[PDB]
PDB file of all heavy atoms in Angstrom:
ATOM      1  N   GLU A 357     119.346-113.540-116.679  1.00 37.65           N
ATOM      2  CA  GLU A 357     120.707-114.143-116.641  1.00 37.65           C
ATOM      3  C   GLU A 357     121.675-113.289-117.465  1.00 37.65           C
ATOM      4  O   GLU A 357     122.731-112.912-116.920  1.00 37.65           O
ATOM      5  CB  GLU A 357     120.698-115.563-117.216  1.00 37.65           C
ATOM      6  CG  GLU A 357     120.657-116.652-116.163  1.00 37.65           C
ATOM      7  CD  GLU A 357     121.928-116.768-115.340  1.00 37.65           C
ATOM      8  OE1 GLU A 357     123.009-116.468-115.881  1.00 37.65           O
ATOM      9  OE2 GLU A 357     121.832-117.157-114.157  1.00 37.65           O
ATOM     10  N   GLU A 358     121.338-113.044-118.738  1.00 34.28           N
ATOM     11  CA  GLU A 358     122.158-112.242-119.688  1.00 34.28           C
ATOM     12  C   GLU A 358     122.502-110.877-119.065  1.00 34.28           C
ATOM     13  O   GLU A 358     123.713-110.556-118.968  1.00 34.28           O
ATOM     14  CB  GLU A 358     121.433-112.050-121.028  1.00 34.28           C
ATOM     15  CG  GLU A 358     121.676-113.150-122.050  1.00 34.28           C
ATOM     16  CD  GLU A 358     121.250-112.818-123.476  1.00 34.28           C
ATOM     17  OE1 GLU A 358     120.035-112.588-123.711  1.00 34.28           O
ATOM     18  OE2 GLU A 358     122.136-112.774-124.361  1.00 34.28           O
ATOM     19  N   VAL A 359     121.491-110.098-118.657  1.00 35.17           N
ATOM     20  CA  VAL A 359     121.638-108.626-118.404  1.00 35.17           C
ATOM     21  C   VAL A 359     122.206-108.384-117.003  1.00 35.17           C
ATOM     22  O   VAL A 359     122.830-107.323-116.795  1.00 35.17           O
ATOM     23  CB  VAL A 359     120.319-107.857-118.612  1.00 35.17           C
ATOM     24  CG1 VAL A 359     119.868-107.945-120.058  1.00 35.17           C
ATOM     25  CG2 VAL A 359     119.210-108.300-117.668  1.00 35.17           C
ATOM     26  N   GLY A 360     122.029-109.344-116.098  1.00 33.85           N
ATOM     27  CA  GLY A 360     122.529-109.260-114.715  1.00 33.85           C
ATOM     28  C   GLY A 360     121.459-108.638-113.836  1.00 33.85           C
ATOM     29  O   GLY A 360     120.344-108.415-114.298  1.00 33.85           O
ATOM     30  N   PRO A 361     121.766-108.380-112.547  1.00 31.33           N
ATOM     31  CA  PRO A 361     120.778-107.863-111.596  1.00 31.33           C
ATOM     32  C   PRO A 361     120.685-106.330-111.459  1.00 31.33           C
ATOM     33  O   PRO A 361     119.806-105.866-110.758  1.00 31.33           O
ATOM     34  CB  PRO A 361     121.304-108.492-110.296  1.00 31.33           C
ATOM     35  CG  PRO A 361     122.814-108.421-110.445  1.00 31.33           C
ATOM     36  CD  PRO A 361     123.077-108.628-111.925  1.00 31.33           C
ATOM     37  N   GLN A 362     121.565-105.574-112.122  1.00 33.22           N
ATOM     38  CA  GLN A 362     121.529-104.083-112.138  1.00 33.22           C
ATOM     39  C   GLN A 362     120.620-103.567-113.271  1.00 33.22           C
ATOM     40  O   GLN A 362     120.401-102.347-113.346  1.00 33.22           O
ATOM     41  CB  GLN A 362     122.943-103.526-112.299  1.00 33.22           C
ATOM     42  CG  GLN A 362     123.747-103.498-111.010  1.00 33.22           C
ATOM     43  CD  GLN A 362     125.191-103.173-111.309  1.00 33.22           C
ATOM     44  OE1 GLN A 362     125.512-102.091-111.801  1.00 33.22           O
ATOM     45  NE2 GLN A 362     126.078-104.120-111.043  1.00 33.22           N
ATOM     46  N   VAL A 363     120.100-104.456-114.120  1.00 33.20           N
ATOM     47  CA  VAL A 363     119.320-104.090-115.332  1.00 33.20           C
ATOM     48  C   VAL A 363     117.946-104.746-115.261  1.00 33.20           C
ATOM     49  O   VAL A 363     117.900-105.971-115.151  1.00 33.20           O
ATOM     50  CB  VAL A 363     120.043-104.495-116.622  1.00 33.20           C
ATOM     51  CG1 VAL A 363     119.142-104.236-117.808  1.00 33.20           C
ATOM     52  CG2 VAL A 363     121.377-103.772-116.777  1.00 33.20           C
ATOM     53  N   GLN A 364     116.873-103.963-115.370  1.00 32.15           N
ATOM     54  CA  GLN A 364     115.494-104.499-115.236  1.00 32.15           C
ATOM     55  C   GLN A 364     115.105-105.249-116.498  1.00 32.15           C
ATOM     56  O   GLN A 364     115.713-105.022-117.554  1.00 32.15           O
ATOM     57  CB  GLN A 364     114.481-103.410-114.928  1.00 32.15           C
ATOM     58  CG  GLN A 364     114.617-102.955-113.489  1.00 32.15           C
ATOM     59  CD  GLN A 364     113.492-102.072-113.027  1.00 32.15           C
ATOM     60  OE1 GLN A 364     113.497-101.603-111.894  1.00 32.15           O
ATOM     61  NE2 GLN A 364     112.545-101.821-113.911  1.00 32.15           N
ATOM     62  N   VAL A 365     114.115-106.113-116.357  1.00 31.33           N
ATOM     63  CA  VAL A 365     113.577-106.914-117.476  1.00 31.33           C
ATOM     64  C   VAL A 365     112.072-106.691-117.529  1.00 31.33           C
ATOM     65  O   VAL A 365     111.387-106.943-116.526  1.00 31.33           O
ATOM     66  CB  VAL A 365     113.982-108.390-117.303  1.00 31.33           C
ATOM     67  CG1 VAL A 365     113.335-109.276-118.345  1.00 31.33           C
ATOM     68  CG2 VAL A 365     115.501-108.507-117.350  1.00 31.33           C
ATOM     69  N   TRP A 366     111.624-106.162-118.660  1.00 28.32           N
ATOM     70  CA  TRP A 366     110.216-105.854-118.969  1.00 28.32           C
ATOM     71  C   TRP A 366     109.783-106.837-120.031  1.00 28.32           C
ATOM     72  O   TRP A 366     110.658-107.232-120.861  1.00 28.32           O
ATOM     73  CB  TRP A 366     110.070-104.425-119.485  1.00 28.32           C
ATOM     74  CG  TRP A 366     110.479-103.363-118.518  1.00 28.32           C
ATOM     75  CD1 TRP A 366     111.175-103.526-117.360  1.00 28.32           C
ATOM     76  CD2 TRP A 366     110.222-101.953-118.634  1.00 28.32           C
ATOM     77  NE1 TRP A 366     111.322-102.323-116.724  1.00 28.32           N
ATOM     78  CE2 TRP A 366     110.757-101.334-117.481  1.00 28.32           C
ATOM     79  CE3 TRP A 366     109.560-101.158-119.573  1.00 28.32           C
ATOM     80  CZ2 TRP A 366     110.698 -99.953-117.266  1.00 28.32           C
ATOM     81  CZ3 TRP A 366     109.481 -99.799-119.352  1.00 28.32           C
ATOM     82  CH2 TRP A 366     110.060 -99.206-118.230  1.00 28.32           C
ATOM     83  N   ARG A 367     108.500-107.163-120.043  1.00 29.87           N
ATOM     84  CA  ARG A 367     107.931-108.057-121.072  1.00 29.87           C
ATOM     85  C   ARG A 367     106.719-107.349-121.668  1.00 29.87           C
ATOM     86  O   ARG A 367     105.828-106.959-120.893  1.00 29.87           O
ATOM     87  CB  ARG A 367     107.606-109.423-120.455  1.00 29.87           C
ATOM     88  CG  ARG A 367     107.042-110.444-121.433  1.00 29.87           C
ATOM     89  CD  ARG A 367     108.089-110.974-122.394  1.00 29.87           C
ATOM     90  NE  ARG A 367     107.540-111.945-123.332  1.00 29.87           N
ATOM     91  CZ  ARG A 367     107.345-111.745-124.635  1.00 29.87           C
ATOM     92  NH1 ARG A 367     107.638-110.585-125.199  1.00 29.87           N
ATOM     93  NH2 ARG A 367     106.852-112.713-125.387  1.00 29.87           N
ATOM     94  N   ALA A 368     106.712-107.198-122.994  1.00 28.85           N
ATOM     95  CA  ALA A 368     105.536-106.782-123.783  1.00 28.85           C
ATOM     96  C   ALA A 368     104.660-108.013-124.026  1.00 28.85           C
ATOM     97  O   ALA A 368     105.202-109.101-124.286  1.00 28.85           O
ATOM     98  CB  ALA A 368     105.962-106.140-125.085  1.00 28.85           C
ATOM     99  N   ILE A 369     103.354-107.846-123.871  1.00 31.26           N
ATOM    100  CA  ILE A 369     102.338-108.899-124.104  1.00 31.26           C
ATOM    101  C   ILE A 369     101.346-108.317-125.104  1.00 31.26           C
ATOM    102  O   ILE A 369     100.810-107.220-124.831  1.00 31.26           O
ATOM    103  CB  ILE A 369     101.692-109.359-122.774  1.00 31.26           C
ATOM    104  CG1 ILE A 369     102.514-110.444-122.072  1.00 31.26           C
ATOM    105  CG2 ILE A 369     100.287-109.889-123.001  1.00 31.26           C
ATOM    106  CD1 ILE A 369     103.612-109.951-121.175  1.00 31.26           C
ATOM    107  N   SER A 370     101.143-109.010-126.227  1.00 31.22           N
ATOM    108  CA  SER A 370     100.085-108.712-127.224  1.00 31.22           C
ATOM    109  C   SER A 370      98.715-109.044-126.614  1.00 31.22           C
ATOM    110  O   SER A 370      98.449-110.238-126.381  1.00 31.22           O
ATOM    111  CB  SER A 370     100.346-109.477-128.504  1.00 31.22           C
ATOM    112  OG  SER A 370      99.642-108.913-129.604  1.00 31.22           O
ATOM    113  N   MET A 371      97.899-108.025-126.318  1.00 30.88           N
ATOM    114  CA  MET A 371      96.526-108.162-125.748  1.00 30.88           C
ATOM    115  C   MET A 371      95.509-108.197-126.897  1.00 30.88           C
ATOM    116  O   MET A 371      94.291-108.353-126.608  1.00 30.88           O
ATOM    117  CB  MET A 371      96.177-106.990-124.819  1.00 30.88           C
ATOM    118  CG  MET A 371      95.572-107.415-123.475  1.00 30.88           C
ATOM    119  SD  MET A 371      96.770-108.159-122.330  1.00 30.88           S
ATOM    120  CE  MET A 371      98.288-107.413-122.918  1.00 30.88           C
ATOM    121  N   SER A 372      95.992-108.001-128.133  1.00 30.94           N
ATOM    122  CA  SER A 372      95.259-108.253-129.404  1.00 30.94           C
ATOM    123  C   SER A 372      94.889-109.743-129.468  1.00 30.94           C
ATOM    124  O   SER A 372      93.782-110.050-129.933  1.00 30.94           O
ATOM    125  CB  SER A 372      96.061-107.800-130.612  1.00 30.94           C
ATOM    126  OG  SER A 372      96.108-106.376-130.705  1.00 30.94           O
ATOM    127  N   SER A 373      95.767-110.627-128.975  1.00 30.77           N
ATOM    128  CA  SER A 373      95.495-112.072-128.749  1.00 30.77           C
ATOM    129  C   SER A 373      94.501-112.220-127.597  1.00 30.77           C
ATOM    130  O   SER A 373      94.465-111.380-126.698  1.00 30.77           O
ATOM    131  CB  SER A 373      96.774-112.846-128.472  1.00 30.77           C
ATOM    132  OG  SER A 373      96.503-114.227-128.232  1.00 30.77           O
ATOM    133  N   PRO A 374      93.645-113.272-127.587  1.00 32.24           N
ATOM    134  CA  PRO A 374      92.833-113.571-126.403  1.00 32.24           C
ATOM    135  C   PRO A 374      93.586-114.376-125.319  1.00 32.24           C
ATOM    136  O   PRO A 374      93.027-114.543-124.246  1.00 32.24           O
ATOM    137  CB  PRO A 374      91.618-114.301-127.010  1.00 32.24           C
ATOM    138  CG  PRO A 374      92.131-114.953-128.294  1.00 32.24           C
ATOM    139  CD  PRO A 374      93.354-114.166-128.722  1.00 32.24           C
ATOM    140  N   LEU A 375      94.828-114.819-125.588  1.00 33.65           N
ATOM    141  CA  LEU A 375      95.725-115.524-124.618  1.00 33.65           C
ATOM    142  C   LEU A 375      96.551-114.506-123.807  1.00 33.65           C
ATOM    143  O   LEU A 375      97.206-114.918-122.814  1.00 33.65           O
ATOM    144  CB  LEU A 375      96.662-116.485-125.368  1.00 33.65           C
ATOM    145  CG  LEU A 375      96.008-117.623-126.161  1.00 33.65           C
ATOM    146  CD1 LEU A 375      94.717-118.098-125.500  1.00 33.65           C
ATOM    147  CD2 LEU A 375      95.744-117.226-127.614  1.00 33.65           C
ATOM    148  N   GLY A 376      96.547-113.234-124.220  1.00 34.47           N
ATOM    149  CA  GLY A 376      97.380-112.160-123.638  1.00 34.47           C
ATOM    150  C   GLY A 376      97.149-111.987-122.147  1.00 34.47           C
ATOM    151  O   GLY A 376      98.121-112.130-121.387  1.00 34.47           O
ATOM    152  N   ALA A 377      95.898-111.730-121.754  1.00 36.18           N
ATOM    153  CA  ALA A 377      95.436-111.569-120.353  1.00 36.18           C
ATOM    154  C   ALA A 377      96.026-112.660-119.449  1.00 36.18           C
ATOM    155  O   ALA A 377      96.463-112.330-118.330  1.00 36.18           O
ATOM    156  CB  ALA A 377      93.926-111.589-120.318  1.00 36.18           C
ATOM    157  N   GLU A 378      96.072-113.903-119.928  1.00 36.66           N
ATOM    158  CA  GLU A 378      96.475-115.094-119.127  1.00 36.66           C
ATOM    159  C   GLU A 378      97.990-115.077-118.912  1.00 36.66           C
ATOM    160  O   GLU A 378      98.428-115.349-117.797  1.00 36.66           O
ATOM    161  CB  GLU A 378      96.072-116.397-119.831  1.00 36.66           C
ATOM    162  CG  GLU A 378      94.623-116.423-120.306  1.00 36.66           C
ATOM    163  CD  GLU A 378      94.197-117.715-120.995  1.00 36.66           C
ATOM    164  OE1 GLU A 378      95.045-118.648-121.107  1.00 36.66           O
ATOM    165  OE2 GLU A 378      93.017-117.794-121.426  1.00 36.66           O
ATOM    166  N   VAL A 379      98.777-114.791-119.952  1.00 38.09           N
ATOM    167  CA  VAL A 379     100.271-114.738-119.828  1.00 38.09           C
ATOM    168  C   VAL A 379     100.644-113.607-118.846  1.00 38.09           C
ATOM    169  O   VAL A 379     101.529-113.842-117.949  1.00 38.09           O
ATOM    170  CB  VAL A 379     100.976-114.577-121.191  1.00 38.09           C
ATOM    171  CG1 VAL A 379     102.488-114.575-121.015  1.00 38.09           C
ATOM    172  CG2 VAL A 379     100.554-115.644-122.200  1.00 38.09           C
ATOM    173  N   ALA A 380      99.955-112.460-118.968  1.00 37.21           N
ATOM    174  CA  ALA A 380     100.152-111.231-118.158  1.00 37.21           C
ATOM    175  C   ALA A 380     100.133-111.582-116.673  1.00 37.21           C
ATOM    176  O   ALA A 380     101.135-111.310-115.981  1.00 37.21           O
ATOM    177  CB  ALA A 380      99.091-110.206-118.496  1.00 37.21           C
ATOM    178  N   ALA A 381      99.051-112.207-116.207  1.00 38.21           N
ATOM    179  CA  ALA A 381      98.865-112.579-114.781  1.00 38.21           C
ATOM    180  C   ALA A 381      99.918-113.612-114.363  1.00 38.21           C
ATOM    181  O   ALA A 381     100.369-113.552-113.213  1.00 38.21           O
ATOM    182  CB  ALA A 381      97.471-113.092-114.533  1.00 38.21           C
ATOM    183  N   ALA A 382     100.314-114.507-115.270  1.00 36.51           N
ATOM    184  CA  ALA A 382     101.275-115.601-114.976  1.00 36.51           C
ATOM    185  C   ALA A 382     102.700-115.046-114.823  1.00 36.51           C
ATOM    186  O   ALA A 382     103.416-115.530-113.917  1.00 36.51           O
ATOM    187  CB  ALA A 382     101.200-116.655-116.049  1.00 36.51           C
ATOM    188  N   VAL A 383     103.100-114.054-115.637  1.00 35.79           N
ATOM    189  CA  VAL A 383     104.512-113.548-115.685  1.00 35.79           C
ATOM    190  C   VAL A 383     104.695-112.264-114.844  1.00 35.79           C
ATOM    191  O   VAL A 383     105.863-111.920-114.567  1.00 35.79           O
ATOM    192  CB  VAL A 383     104.992-113.382-117.142  1.00 35.79           C
ATOM    193  CG1 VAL A 383     104.888-114.703-117.889  1.00 35.79           C
ATOM    194  CG2 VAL A 383     104.274-112.272-117.904  1.00 35.79           C
ATOM    195  N   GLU A 384     103.602-111.640-114.384  1.00 35.01           N
ATOM    196  CA  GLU A 384     103.570-110.391-113.561  1.00 35.01           C
ATOM    197  C   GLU A 384     104.684-110.365-112.502  1.00 35.01           C
ATOM    198  O   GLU A 384     105.304-109.302-112.328  1.00 35.01           O
ATOM    199  CB  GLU A 384     102.199-110.267-112.899  1.00 35.01           C
ATOM    200  CG  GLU A 384     102.138-109.250-111.771  1.00 35.01           C
ATOM    201  CD  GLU A 384     101.187-109.628-110.648  1.00 35.01           C
ATOM    202  OE1 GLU A 384     101.227-110.795-110.189  1.00 35.01           O
ATOM    203  OE2 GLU A 384     100.401-108.752-110.237  1.00 35.01           O
ATOM    204  N   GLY A 385     104.902-111.468-111.783  1.00 34.84           N
ATOM    205  CA  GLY A 385     105.868-111.555-110.666  1.00 34.84           C
ATOM    206  C   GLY A 385     107.288-111.874-111.122  1.00 34.84           C
ATOM    207  O   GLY A 385     108.197-111.781-110.284  1.00 34.84           O
ATOM    208  N   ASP A 386     107.488-112.218-112.395  1.00 34.38           N
ATOM    209  CA  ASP A 386     108.820-112.549-112.975  1.00 34.38           C
ATOM    210  C   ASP A 386     109.477-111.329-113.644  1.00 34.38           C
ATOM    211  O   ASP A 386     110.687-111.426-113.927  1.00 34.38           O
ATOM    212  CB  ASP A 386     108.709-113.672-114.009  1.00 34.38           C
ATOM    213  CG  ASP A 386     108.326-115.012-113.405  1.00 34.38           C
ATOM    214  OD1 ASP A 386     108.918-115.362-112.379  1.00 34.38           O
ATOM    215  OD2 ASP A 386     107.421-115.678-113.965  1.00 34.38           O
ATOM    216  N   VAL A 387     108.728-110.246-113.901  1.00 33.35           N
ATOM    217  CA  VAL A 387     109.251-109.012-114.565  1.00 33.35           C
ATOM    218  C   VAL A 387     109.127-107.787-113.640  1.00 33.35           C
ATOM    219  O   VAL A 387     108.357-107.788-112.673  1.00 33.35           O
ATOM    220  CB  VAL A 387     108.554-108.741-115.910  1.00 33.35           C
ATOM    221  CG1 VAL A 387     108.841-109.836-116.917  1.00 33.35           C
ATOM    222  CG2 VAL A 387     107.049-108.521-115.758  1.00 33.35           C
ATOM    223  N   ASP A 388     109.886-106.752-113.972  1.00 35.63           N
ATOM    224  CA  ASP A 388     109.844-105.427-113.318  1.00 35.63           C
ATOM    225  C   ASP A 388     108.639-104.662-113.891  1.00 35.63           C
ATOM    226  O   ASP A 388     107.945-104.002-113.120  1.00 35.63           O
ATOM    227  CB  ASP A 388     111.224-104.784-113.467  1.00 35.63           C
ATOM    228  CG  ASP A 388     112.331-105.588-112.785  1.00 35.63           C
ATOM    229  OD1 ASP A 388     112.330-105.652-111.547  1.00 35.63           O
ATOM    230  OD2 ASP A 388     113.191-106.147-113.488  1.00 35.63           O
ATOM    231  N   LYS A 389     108.333-104.799-115.183  1.00 34.13           N
ATOM    232  CA  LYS A 389     107.146-104.136-115.773  1.00 34.13           C
ATOM    233  C   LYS A 389     106.560-105.019-116.868  1.00 34.13           C
ATOM    234  O   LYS A 389     107.339-105.687-117.586  1.00 34.13           O
ATOM    235  CB  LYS A 389     107.470-102.763-116.393  1.00 34.13           C
ATOM    236  CG  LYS A 389     107.752-101.609-115.438  1.00 34.13           C
ATOM    237  CD  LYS A 389     106.525-100.892-114.927  1.00 34.13           C
ATOM    238  CE  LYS A 389     106.843 -99.514-114.390  1.00 34.13           C
ATOM    239  NZ  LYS A 389     107.864 -99.569-113.313  1.00 34.13           N
ATOM    240  N   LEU A 390     105.252-104.889-117.064  1.00 35.10           N
ATOM    241  CA  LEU A 390     104.546-105.327-118.287  1.00 35.10           C
ATOM    242  C   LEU A 390     104.245-104.115-119.161  1.00 35.10           C
ATOM    243  O   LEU A 390     103.783-103.088-118.633  1.00 35.10           O
ATOM    244  CB  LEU A 390     103.231-106.012-117.902  1.00 35.10           C
ATOM    245  CG  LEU A 390     103.371-107.281-117.073  1.00 35.10           C
ATOM    246  CD1 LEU A 390     102.029-107.718-116.529  1.00 35.10           C
ATOM    247  CD2 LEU A 390     103.971-108.389-117.902  1.00 35.10           C
ATOM    248  N   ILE A 391     104.434-104.285-120.466  1.00 33.40           N
ATOM    249  CA  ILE A 391     103.837-103.445-121.539  1.00 33.40           C
ATOM    250  C   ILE A 391     102.625-104.198-122.083  1.00 33.40           C
ATOM    251  O   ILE A 391     102.828-105.260-122.664  1.00 33.40           O
ATOM    252  CB  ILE A 391     104.872-103.178-122.650  1.00 33.40           C
ATOM    253  CG1 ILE A 391     106.222-102.743-122.074  1.00 33.40           C
ATOM    254  CG2 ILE A 391     104.316-102.182-123.664  1.00 33.40           C
ATOM    255  CD1 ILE A 391     106.176-101.485-121.229  1.00 33.40           C
ATOM    256  N   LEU A 392     101.422-103.673-121.915  1.00 32.94           N
ATOM    257  CA  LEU A 392     100.187-104.253-122.512  1.00 32.94           C
ATOM    258  C   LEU A 392      99.898-103.565-123.837  1.00 32.94           C
ATOM    259  O   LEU A 392      99.417-102.406-123.797  1.00 32.94           O
ATOM    260  CB  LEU A 392      99.022-104.087-121.538  1.00 32.94           C
ATOM    261  CG  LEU A 392      99.307-104.601-120.130  1.00 32.94           C
ATOM    262  CD1 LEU A 392      98.045-104.599-119.310  1.00 32.94           C
ATOM    263  CD2 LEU A 392      99.932-105.984-120.138  1.00 32.94           C
ATOM    264  N   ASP A 393     100.184-104.255-124.952  1.00 34.29           N
ATOM    265  CA  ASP A 393     100.357-103.648-126.300  1.00 34.29           C
ATOM    266  C   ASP A 393      99.392-104.258-127.332  1.00 34.29           C
ATOM    267  O   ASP A 393      98.848-105.359-127.095  1.00 34.29           O
ATOM    268  CB  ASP A 393     101.821-103.823-126.703  1.00 34.29           C
ATOM    269  CG  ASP A 393     102.341-102.952-127.842  1.00 34.29           C
ATOM    270  OD1 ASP A 393     101.550-102.139-128.448  1.00 34.29           O
ATOM    271  OD2 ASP A 393     103.556-103.113-128.134  1.00 34.29           O
ATOM    272  N   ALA A 394      99.182-103.548-128.444  1.00 33.82           N
ATOM    273  CA  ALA A 394      98.509-104.046-129.673  1.00 33.82           C
ATOM    274  C   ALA A 394      99.526-104.776-130.572  1.00 33.82           C
ATOM    275  O   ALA A 394     100.727-104.382-130.587  1.00 33.82           O
ATOM    276  CB  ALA A 394      97.857-102.897-130.408  1.00 33.82           C
ATOM    277  N   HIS A 395      99.060-105.821-131.270  1.00 31.72           N
ATOM    278  CA  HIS A 395      99.734-106.491-132.420  1.00 31.72           C
ATOM    279  C   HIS A 395     101.158-106.895-132.004  1.00 31.72           C
ATOM    280  O   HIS A 395     101.257-107.647-131.009  1.00 31.72           O
ATOM    281  CB  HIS A 395      99.554-105.614-133.670  1.00 31.72           C
ATOM    282  CG  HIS A 395      98.114-105.475-134.060  1.00 31.72           C
ATOM    283  ND1 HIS A 395      97.429-104.271-133.984  1.00 31.72           N
ATOM    284  CD2 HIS A 395      97.213-106.393-134.487  1.00 31.72           C
ATOM    285  CE1 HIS A 395      96.182-104.446-134.380  1.00 31.72           C
ATOM    286  NE2 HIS A 395      96.019-105.747-134.686  1.00 31.72           N
ATOM    287  N   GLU A 396     102.223-106.455-132.690  1.00 32.76           N
ATOM    288  CA  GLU A 396     103.592-106.659-132.143  1.00 32.76           C
ATOM    289  C   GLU A 396     104.420-105.377-132.231  1.00 32.76           C
ATOM    290  O   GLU A 396     105.516-105.421-132.808  1.00 32.76           O
ATOM    291  CB  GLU A 396     104.329-107.848-132.758  1.00 32.76           C
ATOM    292  CG  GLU A 396     105.367-108.377-131.772  1.00 32.76           C
ATOM    293  CD  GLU A 396     106.333-109.447-132.242  1.00 32.76           C
ATOM    294  OE1 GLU A 396     105.959-110.238-133.135  1.00 32.76           O
ATOM    295  OE2 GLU A 396     107.453-109.495-131.689  1.00 32.76           O
ATOM    296  N   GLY A 397     103.939-104.310-131.591  1.00 34.35           N
ATOM    297  CA  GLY A 397     104.741-103.118-131.264  1.00 34.35           C
ATOM    298  C   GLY A 397     104.840-102.163-132.433  1.00 34.35           C
ATOM    299  O   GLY A 397     105.173-102.612-133.548  1.00 34.35           O
ATOM    300  N   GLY A 398     104.567-100.881-132.188  1.00 31.33           N
ATOM    301  CA  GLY A 398     104.744 -99.819-133.194  1.00 31.33           C
ATOM    302  C   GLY A 398     103.649 -99.848-134.238  1.00 31.33           C
ATOM    303  O   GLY A 398     103.784 -99.125-135.240  1.00 31.33           O
ATOM    304  N   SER A 399     102.589-100.613-133.980  1.00 29.38           N
ATOM    305  CA  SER A 399     101.365-100.710-134.819  1.00 29.38           C
ATOM    306  C   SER A 399     100.728 -99.318-134.984  1.00 29.38           C
ATOM    307  O   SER A 399     100.310 -98.993-136.119  1.00 29.38           O
ATOM    308  CB  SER A 399     100.375-101.721-134.239  1.00 29.38           C
ATOM    309  OG  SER A 399      99.778-101.240-133.037  1.00 29.38           O
ATOM    310  N   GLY A 400     100.656 -98.531-133.898  1.00 27.31           N
ATOM    311  CA  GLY A 400      99.847 -97.296-133.813  1.00 27.31           C
ATOM    312  C   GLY A 400      98.349 -97.582-133.740  1.00 27.31           C
ATOM    313  O   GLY A 400      97.566 -96.619-133.922  1.00 27.31           O
ATOM    314  N   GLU A 401      97.953 -98.833-133.445  1.00 28.06           N
ATOM    315  CA  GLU A 401      96.529 -99.280-133.296  1.00 28.06           C
ATOM    316  C   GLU A 401      96.261 -99.681-131.832  1.00 28.06           C
ATOM    317  O   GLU A 401      97.210-100.111-131.150  1.00 28.06           O
ATOM    318  CB  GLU A 401      96.186-100.465-134.219  1.00 28.06           C
ATOM    319  CG  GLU A 401      96.636-100.316-135.671  1.00 28.06           C
ATOM    320  CD  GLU A 401      95.826 -99.373-136.547  1.00 28.06           C
ATOM    321  OE1 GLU A 401      94.602 -99.586-136.666  1.00 28.06           O
ATOM    322  OE2 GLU A 401      96.427 -98.433-137.123  1.00 28.06           O
TER     323      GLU A 401
END
């Protein structure tokens, strides 16, 4: 809504959580891309 339809929306999902896999499959069709990440970003782990 905020960014409009000319701007893509990506979602990062913490796969360090065991709930990560489940959110990923559920939101896959609502975003242009998923980032499958450690911790909460810039961890380097």
Side-chain angles (χ1 to χ4, degrees):
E357 261 291 329
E358 272 194 298
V359 296
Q362 280 170 63
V363 174
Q364 286 191 182
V365 174
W366 298 13
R367 181 73 180 109
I369 275 86
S370 199
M371 228 73 25
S372 288
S373 179
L375 298 328
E378 311 181 1
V379 182
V383 302
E384 165 213 47
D386 292 314
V387 296
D388 298 292
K389 287 276 199 303
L390 297 169
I391 313 301
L392 308 189
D393 197 358
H395 297 113
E396 206 188 331
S399 71
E401 313 285 303

